[PDB]
Design a protein around this ligand. Structure first.
Ligand SMILES: CC(C)CCC[C@@H](C)[C@H]1CC[C@H]2[C@@H]3CC=C4C[C@@H](O)CC[C@]4(C)[C@H]3CC[C@]12C
Ligand SMILES: O=C(O)c1cccnc1
Lengths: 232, 340, 288, 57, 224
């Protein structure tokens, strides 16, 4: 089980590029695949989505028309192809697998990341704070907020809390605002209602420090709040 | 020799003593006690969903723990997991031996069990990290076809086979940790207690037995049918269980007082039962017949209260959710039906 | 008797049609109607097989039935000797239904006789195992070509001045080659050269296999011959009178219509054979 | 002479099953009635369920 | 589409892929031939198997795949699992005819010919095999022509009178088998003579199944 992606580098403004990933260790043909760009200037957002069966393909309005996505299902490979690269197309790219059936936990394994540098309506989610100083051993809380209700017809609040430790790739913490991913300690939790939610941590350790993010999935494009760093 | 004959005579007079003990502890029929109450109205249940995609006879189904998923098995060599609310398909699992007779769902949601007409019970892991279902363990050692299986825990299972033997198994080691013997003919079914401390089995010698998980203790023997016995279930309380035979009859047996409680027979039915199941309050008994349709019995008066007439062929399997929401029904036409 | 529709076309009105044609046509209506009606009722209400061989007969049991409803108005046309009083549209929809059902009761009568051949000489073949969702498509295509070869009978100002009355018809004795007569001959020649071949090979190959010793094989053989010879009897006569007509047109000019005086009368009797099948089509396929 | 051993097994099984105490049938029937009466409200099949909150409609 | 959410519009597509796979895979099971093999103990079942819980067997003859099910090791009730073979093309039934005086290890008096005759009778009138054809194999004819000359078959056939030669005795035994049928219009029993021949067995089976298939197709379209 691993997603090894390559294709990054430094590019001209006018010019194409390709980003491939190899998914070794699982049944790749049963996984819808996302690209999530991460601008170095605290930039985060969803890029593109291709499903299991090459039926659906989705883009975020800022990208539609210049990126194309594809699969190589016999050889377990995922491709992105980019044609027009503006000056604000410099960031890092995370390929995320996710499988949708009842009870699943999408956005589970998050790849490693590939850096791309360029030569020189939508729901809104808000994380007003940016930094919370605190000492280990005591509880902490972070807030995120949207602009409308998320209790959809299927009753599921499509908010995803997930973490990035310094120098590491992210990992899922809380999918659907009330469910904790697998492999992470049970110290993390989260609760909210309406348009406002809070991630909570009861016991504080040295690994728990990092930058936290919130995701909505109700409809494409997928939109975030900002980052709220915890500091030692 | 003479010892054989004297032991046989002693056994016969013990049988007479046990028969007299069973007879002498009964005072009134369960119908007399249950006749004061009023009967439920005409239970009108309509087909809400219709699960289709099986291409051959369906032999078993089992309701999931959260009362939204279920699994089914057919002679096509496939096992299928459903979403009852949406009518989606969550998983399709290919089998090795096309000749199946039962399937089972783990009470946590990680595993499903299968096997039949091959003397091997296979275990499947659903929540793997590779995304696909895989074979966990292959319990082998029986010498007759497997007729039922039911998870006791996440690591203990119990099966009954056609070689007149039940067995309690560990999935980790793979070796029988208990063997239950004492039946003469093929064993057709078993059902687990609510608290997983006892379980009952029913066999082709027109007899059923109450076992004991911890040590192997055969605690009690029930009779009464004059043909095979291919369906049993505990009452939700855990103090009773009902049987469905091949001579177009269903019966109710009590654990504490070991006699007959209820006979569910009707002259216009001349063909035998395939499946039985209960309701959340233990008020409805659903019986799957082979006159092509199911039947709903008021389990306290024995009279009918509804018919699920919707199938083209014989009914094999049948189940009820844990919350009491719906009832699911399979048959030999390869169509599952959810009723509310 | 010579008039001009758009061409030099003879036309007659003989006082012998009235005596014989209305009774023939009324009997063929009143029995063909029920004969196809209960067949279609069974196919729709009291039969639950629905195999890729019972949805080729269903189409043949709607084609002929449509021809029936069209009959009483033709009986009214003959009872008053070529006097049409219902205007333009009823005439122009009475001569497209008849001409499109008949070609569509012969296209769904050949497919059966190919079904059977692929079920005898070529057992366990692919076309024996097609689903009844890939046979309704070909039924729709067959209806499509049927309708596409008969549309030219709505695009014409049909009722015509004969002086005395108005004649509602498609079969008139002219001297110009066209598509309708060629269709009339070619809707009989090709299905014959297919049915004979299929119905002979089925019987022969069910006989060089020494298999014709159970009764039901013999019964099937008899009914196969029944089908072929009933087709030839109920269709052939009309296709030789029209050849005699073309013979007379090419040999003798259309200047003395009196020559045709008798033969055409015979034609409008032999054409009453073409409806004949729609009466006794079910008694061969759907009942016995 | 294993036949007498099998007879010994069977008679031991009879000794083994002849050592239990029983109750009256009417008491079991009353317990069944009581359990049915207590849970009459939580089962969406016996009492005609309102069409407001079921998730299969 | 509109009423659904972005995480209930991939569940539907996944279910559709499941359905497509199920349908495409259920077409390779309605074109194969299924044959159920039976015999009476040491009746040469292994012999015919070599001539070509459950024991599957695979072979292909003339671009046509057969699946032979051998259920000899069940040693349990037959009525509890026989109906699982209801939709089978044919039943192969193998028996050795050189074994009329050789009696079973169970009873000295009863021989194995009578036991196998009872078996063939019992398989020929079950309610699940009303229209199911039976292919009959008579075995060890080599040893039989020697055995019959030493001792008459009157021992096994008290009501029989024959000159104790090969052909008449073999034909009498064959008649005694084929008279056991009780349907005679829907069903047909196909019989054959082989000891160790390498060509006649599989061709016999192929002919017997082509005849059944022809009948099935012709009665499917009403004509038959
Ligand atoms: C079972 C499946 C394969 C049946 C296929 C039927 C095909 C092979 C045959 C059956 C009868 C045939 C038709 C017989 C006669 C006519 C009328 C003629 O004016 C045009 C061709 C047309 C319309 C033929 C087209 C081909 C046809 C439709
Ligand atoms: O069959 C016809 O189309 C027809 C019938 C009567 C007169 N003219 C044509």
């Amino acid at each position: 089980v691993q997603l090894v992606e390559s294709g990054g580098g430094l590019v001209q403004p006018g010019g194409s590029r390709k980003l491939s990933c190899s998914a070794s260790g699982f049944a790749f043909s049963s996984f819808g695949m996302h690209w999530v760009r991460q601008a170095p200037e605290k930039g985060l957002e969803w890029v593109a989505y291709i499903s299991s069966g090459s039926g659906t393909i989705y883009y975020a309005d800022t990208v539609k028309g210049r990126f194309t996505i594809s699969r190589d299902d016999p050889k377990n490979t995922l491709f992105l192809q980019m044609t027009s690269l503006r000056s604000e197309d410099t960031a890092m790219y995370y390929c995320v697998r996710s499988i949708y059936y009842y009870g699943s936990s999408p956005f589970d394994f998050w790849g490693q990341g590939t850096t791309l540098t360029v030569s020189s309506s939508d729901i809104v989610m808000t994380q007003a704070t940016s930094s919370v100083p605190v000492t280990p051993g005591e509880s902490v809380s972070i807030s995120c907020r949207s602009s409308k209700s998320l209790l959809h017809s299927n009753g599921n609040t499509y908010l995803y809390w997930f973490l990035q430790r310094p120098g590491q790739s992210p990992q899922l913490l809380i999918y659907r605002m009330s469910n904790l991913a697998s492999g992470v300690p049970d110290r993390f939790s989260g609760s909210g209602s309406g348009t406002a939610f809070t991630l909570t941590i009861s016991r504080l350790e040295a690994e728990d420090v990092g930058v936290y993010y919130c995701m909505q999935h109700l409809e494409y494009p997928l939109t975030f709040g900002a980052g709220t760093k915890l500091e030692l | 020799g003479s010892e054989l004959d004297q032991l046989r005579q002693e056994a016969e007079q013990l049988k007479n003593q046990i028969r007299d003990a069973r007879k002498a502890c009964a005072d009134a029929t369960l119908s007399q006690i249950t006749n004061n109450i009023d009967p439920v109205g005409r239970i009108q249940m309509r087909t809400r969903r219709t699960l289709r995609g099986h291409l051959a006879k369906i032999y078993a189904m089992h309701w999931g723990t959260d009362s939204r998923l279920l699994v089914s098995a057919s002679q096509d060599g496939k096992l299928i997991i459903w979403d009852s609310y949406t009518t989606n398909k969550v998983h399709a699992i290919p089998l090795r031996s096309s000749w199946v007779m039962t399937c089972a769902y783990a009470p946590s949601g990680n595993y499903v069990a299968c096997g039949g007409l091959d003397n091997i019970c296979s275990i499947y892991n659903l929540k793997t990290r590779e995304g696909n279902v895989r074979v966990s363990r292959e319990l082998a050692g029986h010498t007759g076809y497997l007729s039922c299986c039911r998870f006791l825990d996440d690591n203990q299972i119990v099966t009954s086979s056609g070689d007149t033997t039940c067995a309690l198994w560990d999935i980790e080691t793979g070796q029988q940790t208990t063997t239950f013997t004492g039946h003469t003919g093929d064993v057709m079914s078993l059902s687990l207690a609510p608290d997983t401390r006892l379980f009952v089995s029913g066999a082709c010698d027109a007899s059923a037995k109450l076992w004991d998980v911890r040590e192997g203790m055969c605690r009690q023997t029930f009779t009464g049918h004059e043909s095979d016995i291919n369906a049993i279930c505990f009452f939700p309380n855990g103090n009773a269980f009902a049987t469905g035979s091949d001579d177009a009859t269903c019966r109710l047996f009590d654990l504490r007082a070991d006699q007959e409680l209820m006979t569910y027979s009707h002259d216009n039915i001349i063909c035998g039962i395939t499946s039985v199941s209960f309701s959340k309050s233990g008020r409805l008994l659903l019986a799957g017949y082979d006159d092509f349709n199911c039947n709903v019995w008021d389990a306290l008066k024995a009279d009918r209260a509804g018919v699920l007439a919707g199938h083209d062929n014989r009914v094999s399997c049948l189940g009820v959710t844990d919350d009491g929401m719906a009832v699911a029904t399979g048959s030999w036409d390869s169509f599952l039906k959810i009723w509310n | 008797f010579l008039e001009i529709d758009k061409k030099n076309c003879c036309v007659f009105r003989d006082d012998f049609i009235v005596k014989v044609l209305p009774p023939v046509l009324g009997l063929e209506f009143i029995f063909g109607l029920l004969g196809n009606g209960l067949a279609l009722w069974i196919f729709c209400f009291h039969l639950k097989s629905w195999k890729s061989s019972r949805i080729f007969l269903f189409n043949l049991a709607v084609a002929d039935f449509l021809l029936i409803i069209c009959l009483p108005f033709l009986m009214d046309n003959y009872v008053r000797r070529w006097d049409w009083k219902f205007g333009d549209i009823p005439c122009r929809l009475m001569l497209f239904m008849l001409a499109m059902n008949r070609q569509g009761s012969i296209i769904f009568l050949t497919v059966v006789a190919v079904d059977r051949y692929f079920r005898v000489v070529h057992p366990h073949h692919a076309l024996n195992k097609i689903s009844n969702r890939t046979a309704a498509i070909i039924s729709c295509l067959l209806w499509g070509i049927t309708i596409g070869l008969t549309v030219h009978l709505l695009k014409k100002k049909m009722p015509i001045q004969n002086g005395g009355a108005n004649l509602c018809s498609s079969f008139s004795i002219c001297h110009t080659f066209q598509w309708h007569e060629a269709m009339f001959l070619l809707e009989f020649f090709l299905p014959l050269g297919i049915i004979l071949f299929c119905s002979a090979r089925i019987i022969w190959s069910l006989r060089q296999r020494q298999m014709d010793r159970h009764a039901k094989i013999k019964r099937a053989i008899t009914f196969i011959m029944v089908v072929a010879i009933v087709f030839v009897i109920c269709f052939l006569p009309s296709v030789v009178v029209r050849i005699r007509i073309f013979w007379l047109l090419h040999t003798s000019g259309t200047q003395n219509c009196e020559v045709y005086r008798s033969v055409d009368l015979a034609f409008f009797i032999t054409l009453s054979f073409t409806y004949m099948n729609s009466m006794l089509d079910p008694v061969v396929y759907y009942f016995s | 002479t294993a036949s007498i051993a099998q007879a010994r097994k069977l008679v031991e099984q009879l000794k083994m099953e002849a050592n239990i105490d029983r109750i009256k049938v009417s008491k079991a029937a009353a317990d069944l009635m009581a359990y049915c009466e207590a849970h009459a409200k939580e089962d969406p099949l016996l009492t005609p369920v309102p069409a407001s909150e079921n998730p299969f409609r | 589409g509109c009423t659904l959410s972005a995480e209930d519009k991939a569940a539907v597509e996944r279910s559709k892929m499941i359905d497509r796979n199920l349908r495409e895979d259920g077409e390779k099971a309605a074109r194969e031939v299924k044959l159920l093999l039976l015999g009476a103990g040491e009746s040469g079942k292994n012999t015919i198997v070599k001539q070509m819980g459950i024991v599957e067997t695979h072979f292909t003859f003339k671009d046509l795949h057969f699946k032979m099910f051998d259920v000899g090791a069940q040693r349990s009730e037959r009525k509890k699992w026989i109906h699982c073979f209801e939709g089978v093309t044919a039943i192969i039934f193998c028996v050795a005819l050189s074994d009329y005086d050789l009696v079973l290890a169970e009873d000295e008096e009863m021989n194995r010919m009578h036991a196998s005759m009872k078996l063939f009778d019992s398989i020929c009138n079950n309610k699940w095999f009303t229209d199911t054809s039976i292919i009959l194999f008579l075995n060890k004819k080599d040893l039989f022509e020697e055995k019959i000359k030493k001792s008459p078959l009157t021992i096994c056939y008290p009501e029989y009178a024959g000159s104790n030669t090969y052909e008449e005795a073999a034909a009498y035994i064959q008649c005694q088998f084929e008279d056991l049928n009780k349907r005679k219009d829907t069903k047909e029993i196909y019989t054959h003579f082989t000891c160790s021949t390498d060509t006649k067995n599989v061709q016999f089976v192929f002919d017997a199944v082509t005849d059944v298939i022809i009948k099935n197709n012709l009665k499917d379209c009403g004509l038959f």
